[PDB]
Design a protein around this nucleic acid. Structure first.
Ligand SMILES: [Zn+2]
Ligand SMILES: [Zn+2]
Lengths: 37, 131, 122, 118, 204, 59
RNA sequence: CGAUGUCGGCUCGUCGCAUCCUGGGGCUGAAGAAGGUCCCAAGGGUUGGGCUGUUCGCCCAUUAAAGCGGCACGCGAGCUGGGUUCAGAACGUCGUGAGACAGUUCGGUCUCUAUCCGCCACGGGCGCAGGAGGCUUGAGGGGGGCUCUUCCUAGUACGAGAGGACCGGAAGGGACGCACCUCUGGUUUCCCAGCUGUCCCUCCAGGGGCAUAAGCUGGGUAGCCAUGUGCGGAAGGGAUAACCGCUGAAAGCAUCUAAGCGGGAAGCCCGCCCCAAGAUGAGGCCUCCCGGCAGCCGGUAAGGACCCGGGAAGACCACCCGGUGGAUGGGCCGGGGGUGUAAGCGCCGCGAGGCGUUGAGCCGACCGGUCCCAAUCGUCCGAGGUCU
């Protein structure tokens, strides 16, 4: 879960959600899993 | 309620009674049960009773011997079941209820300061005489 | 109750005579050391041409304590010294043969080498 | 923490406490009744009752025991001659303490007099 | 929850299984209940236990009527065992059994105006190297102008002990039915003869 | 020890406030059952010089 | 600048989290183990020492770790004074010089009384709409909270092997906190004994004072204690963080979220311990008491206080207990306990002395009994119950 401020897509599979007031870069790659913060 | 009396009662069930009365300066071999590993044998500690603190059932004593040029002071609950028995090898006539000074004396000095109790010894000879 | 700076007699034939407790390998902050305790000491006195020379820092085991020691029986044993056994890092007696009596707790802490080698276990 | 510790210090060191007791006892036997601060009297009860008890025993050994404290021949004579017999039947409580009505003017001390029992 | 009044008669070690297990001896029973704290009447569960008995000519009319509404002889001390509805009318040591875990509540020995070292184990000050008249003081007790006060609960001198104290998870070494004596491993708060309350341990 | 010193003067009301508790309780006395004279309990009535219904002091 | 004492160390801590360990988790270039990183997490802990004035740092040895900081670079009306930075002295150096240092080196006065707020304890007054005696409850408050090792699981899973698990259990630790004194150990101010000098009693003997506010020494009950022993960190419930979810539209799909629901941490609350109805919201239960001039007076009832004997209660006060029926204390007695065979006598010895008498004699607390002493005798406060 990469935490950062500039969460962004990495691959096309990088799907984004605003889950519980935060923005999550969810994808198949666990490396791509990002939490904006 | 006589609190000390009650303590007397509770300790009554655990009082060992048969052991030979002795005083400091005497030399004794203790049949003391020991639990080594799983079995439990009985090894004996023989030395001088350098001390007897008398607290009723909680009365205890200490024995002193020099094991391999090393003075081992050992203490025993006077009413422990683990004390199989007591053996008076010697009636060393001291002159004080405590005998700590022998901690710092040569063995020759020790024997010199502790002479045999002619009276108590002559009694034990006088005793040990069955019908 | 052995603590740092304490001098200990090495009760075996490693070559040392006395050692100084400089730590107590029992937790990180244990105050004292006693029977069966593994201390770390330095060689302050060794026979000439022994296995270990002075300044050697070696793990030892407390085999005798001038402070009294209780036991669940209620009995108390107490030596007229404070001795220890220079061991390896495996709780194995580095010296071949020990001197003087020792305490049975070494059995209680897996020191059967010392107990057997002990001339008189107590 | 004075837990169960018996005996007043009386604001005097050891030997002065003792010599106080001895002098007080001397005066008491010399007069039967005396006047003293209350705590001194209460500490004086046992110290006198004991000596009187040794009077009731009366042997030579008691003579030298009590004489260790009184330190007088004639006084211990009166003790073993008039004082001992009159208390031949009483077990303990050989003296009585009574508190006086007026304090001491000089410092307000509460006065109490000690007497041998009738 | 089982409990019983008791008095600390003294300590002693005894020998079970070649162990000089030290115990405190405690004259507990018999304890007659005098009033059962019921929720409808009192909003909770408990009972009221008399121990030890008191001189009839030393009891006031209110308490006397309190034992008339009860049936017990006038009794010196009276306490409540919270959450304990004994079927019986006089609790005794039989409610417990040797080997059972208990918690004891008593008043530790009053140590008066305890110094700060004896009361909180403050290190105090050195005995030499120039320590001027401060060998047992707590040193600093706060901070400078911020916040410039003393926090609540700062450890200081005061009465150490003389207070309701509860040691917990003690073991019933042995009960003594005929004597109402009970044997508990370890030590119990309070002096000999000081009243105590024996209670089942809340542990598990 | 840097010589602690009273910061301000104590007002009259505060001084009297602390002096509230300084009352001197009347020394309780009782009448002598020998001489009907007031006196403190548990002491010989110096008037009668008796105590416990019997003479001790030589008034 | 009619004074805000400056580094350092000590004591005492409190707090932040930008977390060192312990708790949880994500990803991994995570096979397992050990890791790296990041996220949540401040409950607890975060060692001893050498050097140096030092903080700092290095090092030694450990640890789970050996956190960074704030609190006037915390803390001197709490300590110190090592450094800095008074005056003296010296060195290198600059100056002609007197002198200078930020360079060094040695020495160098740290000020009894707390008024107020604050904090720690204890009280008195009044209140708590009748007065009392008890018992409680518990608003809320505080304490605590830890960690490690070993073993079985299991040498199992994983792994070529090496190595080596998860989870789940059990045992033992260290440190810390509380209590207690059975055991060990310490003090044990006159409890016992010994011994030296001096003077005295009384010549001997046997004693006493002084040698410290015990002359010294050998012991030591109680009490107080740690180094002694016992106990504790809970378990569990709830809500939860990170995180992981199930169902699922918006948005045909999918989506842990939008509706909803779940799990999920040494974290929070409770749960454990203690305080606590001044909780002025003054709580609740039980028991006891019953006139004359919202009132007012009266002695009162219950009850209490003073007084007194005390007390592991205590600075005082307070608290507890006792008060003739009483064992409350002092005696006495007995037991425990300590010291260790009293004196006197007799015997032996030229004597010093020794033997028996004799485990004697003395004996502070300790445990109980005995009313011998004394808590005598007493006085006073204290109800007539607010009204809808
Ligand atoms: Zn992606
Ligand atoms: Zn009169």
């Amino acid at each position: 879960m990469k935490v950062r401020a500039s969460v962004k897509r990495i691959c096309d599979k990088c799907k984004v959600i605003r889950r519980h007031g935060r923005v999550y870069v969810i994808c198949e790659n666990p490396k791509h899993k990002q939490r904006q913060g | 309620m006589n609190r000390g009396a009650l303590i007397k009662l509770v300790e009554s069930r655990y009082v060992r009674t048969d052991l030979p009365e002795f005083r400091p300066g005497d030399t004794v071999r203790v049949s003391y049960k020991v639990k080594e590993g799983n079995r439990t044998r009985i090894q004996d500690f023989e030395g001088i009773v350098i001390r007897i603190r008398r607290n009723g059932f909680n009365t205890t004593f200490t024995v002193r011997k020099v094991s391999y040029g090393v003075g081992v002071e050992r203490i025993f609950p006077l009413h422990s079941p683990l004390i199989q028995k007591i053996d008076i090898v010697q009636r060393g006539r001291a002159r004080r209820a405590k005998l700590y000074f022998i901690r710092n004396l040569s063995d020759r000095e020790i024997r010199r300061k502790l002479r045999a109790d002619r009276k108590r010894i002559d009694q034990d000879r006088a005793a040990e005489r069955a019908a | 109750m052995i603590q740092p700076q304490t001098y200990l007699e090495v009760a075996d034939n490693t070559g040392a005579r006395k050692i100084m407790c400089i730590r107590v390998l029992k937790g990180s902050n244990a105050k004292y050391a006693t029977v069966g305790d593994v201390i770390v000491a330095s060689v302050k006195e060794a026979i000439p041409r022994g296995a270990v020379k002075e300044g050697d820092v070696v793990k030892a085991v407390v085999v005798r304590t001038k402070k009294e020691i209780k036991r669940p029986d209620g009995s108390a044993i107490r030596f007229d010294d404070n001795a220890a056994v220079i061991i390896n890092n495996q709780l194995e007696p580095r010296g071949t043969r020990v001197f003087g009596p020792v305490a049975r707790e070494l059995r209680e802490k897996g020191f059967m080498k010392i107990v057997s080698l002990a001339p008189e276990v107590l | 923490m004075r837990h169960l510790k018996s005996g007043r210090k009386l604001n005097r060191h050891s030997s002065h406490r003792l010599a106080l007791y001895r002098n007080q006892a001397k005066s008491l036997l010399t007069h039967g009744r005396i006047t003293t601060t209350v705590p001194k009297a209460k500490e004086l009860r046992g110290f006198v009752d004991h000596l009187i008890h040794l009077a009731k025993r009366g042997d030579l050994h008691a003579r030298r025991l009590v004489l260790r404290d009184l330190q007088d021949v004639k006084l211990v004579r009166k003790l073993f001659d008039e004082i001992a017999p009159r208390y031949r039947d009483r077990q303990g409580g050989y003296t009585r303490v009574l508190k006086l009505a007026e304090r001491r003017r000089g410092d307000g001390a509460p006065l109490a007099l000690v007497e041998l029992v009738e | 929850m089982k409990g019983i009044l008791g008095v600390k008669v003294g300590m002693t070690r005894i020998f079970r299984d070649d162990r000089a297990v030290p115990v405190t001896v405690i004259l507990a029973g018999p304890c007659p209940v005098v009033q059962r704290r019921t929720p409808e009447k009192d909003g909770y569960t408990a009972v009221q236990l008399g121990f030890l008995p008191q001189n009839p000519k030393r009891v006031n009319r209110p308490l006397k009527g309190h034992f008339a509404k009860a049936g017990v002889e006038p009794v010196r001390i009276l306490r409540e065992i919270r959450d304990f509805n004994p079927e019986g009318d006089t609790v005794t040591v039989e409610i417990f059994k040797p080997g059972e875990r208990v918690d004891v509540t008593g008043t530790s020995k009053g140590r008066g105006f305890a110094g700060v070292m004896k009361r909180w184990n403050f290190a105090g000050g050195p005995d030499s190297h120039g320590a001027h008249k401060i060998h047992r003081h707590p040193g600093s007790i706060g901070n400078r102008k911020t916040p410039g006060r003393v926090y609540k609960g700062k450890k200081m001198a005061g009465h150490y002990g003389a207070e309701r104290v509860t040691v917990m998870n003690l073991e019933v070494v042995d009960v003594i039915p005929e004597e109402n004596l009970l044997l508990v491993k370890g030590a119990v708060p309070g002096p000999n003869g000081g009243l105590v309350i024996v209670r089942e341990t809340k542990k598990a | 020890a840097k010589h602690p010193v009273p910061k301000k003067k104590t007002s009259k009301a505060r001084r009297d406030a602390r002096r509230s508790h300084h009352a001197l309780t009347p020394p309780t006395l009782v009448p002598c059952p020998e001489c009907k004279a007031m006196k403190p309990p548990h002491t010989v009535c110096p008037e009668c010089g008796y105590y416990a219904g019997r003479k001790v002091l030589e008034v």
